[PDB]
Design an enzyme around this catalytic site. Structure first.
Site, mmCIF file in Angstrom:
data_model
loop_
_atom_site.group_PDB
_atom_site.id
_atom_site.type_symbol
_atom_site.label_atom_id
_atom_site.label_comp_id
_atom_site.label_asym_id
_atom_site.label_seq_id
_atom_site.Cartn_x
_atom_site.Cartn_y
_atom_site.Cartn_z
ATOM 1 N N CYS A 25 -3.664 0.160 -1.480
ATOM 2 C CA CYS A 25 -3.987 0.110 -0.028
ATOM 3 C C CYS A 25 -2.978 0.944 0.775
ATOM 4 O O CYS A 25 -3.398 1.689 1.678
ATOM 5 C CB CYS A 25 -4.008 -1.329 0.471
ATOM 6 S SG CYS A 25 -2.490 -2.247 0.096
ATOM 7 N N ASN A 175 -10.878 0.085 6.732
ATOM 8 C CA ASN A 175 -10.473 -0.584 5.471
ATOM 9 C C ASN A 175 -10.841 0.339 4.305
ATOM 10 O O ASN A 175 -11.597 1.305 4.531
ATOM 11 C CB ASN A 175 -11.102 -1.977 5.350
ATOM 12 C CG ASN A 175 -10.379 -2.889 4.380
ATOM 13 O OD1 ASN A 175 -9.375 -2.511 3.778
ATOM 14 N ND2 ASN A 175 -10.888 -4.100 4.215
HETATM 15 C C1 LIG Z 1 -2.671 -3.374 -1.025
HETATM 16 O O1 LIG Z 1 -3.559 -2.819 -1.982
HETATM 17 C C2 LIG Z 1 -1.460 -4.034 -1.662
HETATM 18 C C3 LIG Z 1 -1.836 -5.262 -2.502
HETATM 19 C C4 LIG Z 1 -0.651 -5.947 -3.138
HETATM 20 C C5 LIG Z 1 0.208 -6.737 -2.382
HETATM 21 C C6 LIG Z 1 1.306 -7.352 -2.965
HETATM 22 C C7 LIG Z 1 1.557 -7.191 -4.313
HETATM 23 C C8 LIG Z 1 0.710 -6.415 -5.076
HETATM 24 C C9 LIG Z 1 -0.386 -5.796 -4.495
HETATM 25 N N1 LIG Z 1 -0.531 -4.413 -0.598
HETATM 26 C C10 LIG Z 1 0.661 -3.838 -0.399
HETATM 27 O O2 LIG Z 1 1.016 -2.809 -0.965
HETATM 28 C C11 LIG Z 1 1.583 -4.532 0.604
HETATM 29 N N2 LIG Z 1 2.972 -4.206 0.323
HETATM 30 C C12 LIG Z 1 3.957 -5.109 0.393
HETATM 31 O O3 LIG Z 1 3.760 -6.311 0.548
HETATM 32 C C13 LIG Z 1 5.378 -4.569 0.243
HETATM 33 N N3 LIG Z 1 6.265 -5.160 1.235
HETATM 34 C C14 LIG Z 1 6.341 -4.694 2.508
HETATM 35 O O4 LIG Z 1 5.495 -3.949 2.997
HETATM 36 N N4 LIG Z 1 7.429 -5.115 3.198
HETATM 37 C C15 LIG Z 1 8.540 -4.218 3.475
HETATM 38 C C16 LIG Z 1 9.889 -4.890 3.162
HETATM 39 C C17 LIG Z 1 10.838 -3.990 2.410
HETATM 40 C C18 LIG Z 1 11.286 -2.801 2.971
HETATM 41 C C19 LIG Z 1 12.119 -1.948 2.268
HETATM 42 C C20 LIG Z 1 12.522 -2.278 0.982
HETATM 43 O O5 LIG Z 1 13.329 -1.434 0.277
HETATM 44 C C21 LIG Z 1 12.092 -3.468 0.412
HETATM 45 C C22 LIG Z 1 11.258 -4.312 1.126
HETATM 46 C C23 LIG Z 1 8.508 -3.723 4.912
HETATM 47 O O6 LIG Z 1 8.733 -4.667 5.790
HETATM 48 O O7 LIG Z 1 8.292 -2.561 5.194
HETATM 49 C C24 LIG Z 1 5.878 -4.813 -1.193
HETATM 50 C C25 LIG Z 1 5.241 -3.868 -2.210
HETATM 51 C C26 LIG Z 1 5.628 -4.268 -3.620
HETATM 52 N N5 LIG Z 1 5.351 -5.682 -3.838
HETATM 53 C C27 LIG Z 1 5.348 -6.596 -2.853
HETATM 54 N N6 LIG Z 1 5.117 -7.854 -3.005
HETATM 55 N N7 LIG Z 1 5.603 -6.198 -1.592
HETATM 56 C C28 LIG Z 1 1.194 -4.177 2.053
HETATM 57 C C29 LIG Z 1 1.358 -2.688 2.333
HETATM 58 C C30 LIG Z 1 1.977 -5.003 3.068
#
Ligand SMILES: *[C@@H](O)[C@H](Cc1ccccc1)NC(=O)[C@@H](NC(=O)[C@@H](NC(=O)N[C@H](Cc1ccc(O)cc1)C(=O)O)[C@@H]1CCN=C(N)N1)C(C)C
Length: 212
Positions: A25, A175
């Site tokens: 995403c 989306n």
């Molecule tokens: C969409 O297809 C995916 C689905 C998914 C979500 C969670 C786990 C696996 C798949 N969604 C995302 O890619 C989401 N990413 C995250 O949740 C992301 N975290 C953040 O966006 N938060 C950061 C915090 C941060 C900033 C900098 C560093 O170095 C570390 C942390 C922010 O506030 O910018 C990460 C991605 C990897 N795994 C998890 N759980 N979270 C959405 C884009 C939100």
């Protein structure tokens, strides 16, 4: 800024994509904002490679999720290929940017919208498509078929999408779940509730590319 914005009306939005089971995403969200700003700056609407960001963004975790801002940083620092030349496979593979010749487009940086601020996000959307995050895990969001979406949903953001417009009562979202979902792949999410998180945490983390 005006009462209605719809970047589809100015030919700055490409067809709706389907990311599939892959947690890409963040790459889809970033690409919508690149397609937007290139149209606004150059007058040309092109499709750019989500797959390239999936493969090449070492900060993100491929199909296990990632960061729209890191994807946008990569396009500012290096650039991005046309989608046609680097098509979407729905699986993370080796970064193949070098093998696919020179980049098709490049940006000059990435900016964050002041978070938890509806006015700040609307101001940015008035200027260009914006990468936004929300909570998509809820069944209400998953089964959304149309109308102004109010939830139910929490603020536990888990999904990156693109804000391509707004109206008096909603923000218009592209989306990456194909054209069968919501309003031909779009959702209008309720705004103006006074909740600083936004509906489904929509104001948590918003980025747009910069290009001169
Ligand atoms: C969409 O297809 C995916 C689905 C998914 C979500 C969670 C786990 C696996 C798949 N969604 C995302 O890619 C989401 N990413 C995250 O949740 C992301 N975290 C953040 O966006 N938060 C950061 C915090 C941060 C900033 C900098 C560093 O170095 C570390 C942390 C922010 O506030 O910018 C990460 C991605 C990897 N795994 C998890 N759980 N979270 C959405 C884009 C939100």
């Amino acid at each position: 800024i005006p009462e209605y914005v719809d970047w589809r009306q100015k030919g700055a939005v490409t067809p709706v994509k389907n990311q599939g089971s892959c947690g890409s995403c963040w790459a889809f969200s970033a690409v919508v904002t690149i397609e937007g700003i290139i149209k606004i700056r150059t007058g040309n609407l092109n499709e750019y490679s989500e797959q390239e960001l999936l493969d090449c963004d070492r900060r993100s975790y491929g199909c296990n999720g990632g960061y729209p801002w890191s994807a946008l940083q990569l396009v500012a620092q290096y650039g991005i290929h046309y989608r046609n030349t680097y098509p979407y496979e729905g699986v993370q593979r080796y970064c193949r940017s070098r093998e696919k010749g020179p980049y098709a487009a490049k940006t000059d940086g990435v900016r964050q919208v002041q978070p938890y601020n509806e006015g700040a996000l609307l101001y940015s959307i008035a200027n260009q498509p914006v990468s936004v995050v929300l909570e998509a895990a809820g069944k209400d969001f998953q089964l959304y078929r149309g109308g102004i979406f109010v939830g139910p949903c929490g603020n536990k953001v888990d999904h990156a999408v693109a804000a391509v417009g707004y109206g008096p009562n909603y923000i218009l979202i592209k989306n990456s779940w194909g054209t069968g979902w919501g309003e031909n792949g779009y959702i209008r999410i309720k705004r103006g509730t006074g909740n600083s998180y936004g509906v489904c945490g929509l104001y948590t983390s918003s980025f747009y590319p910069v290009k001169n």
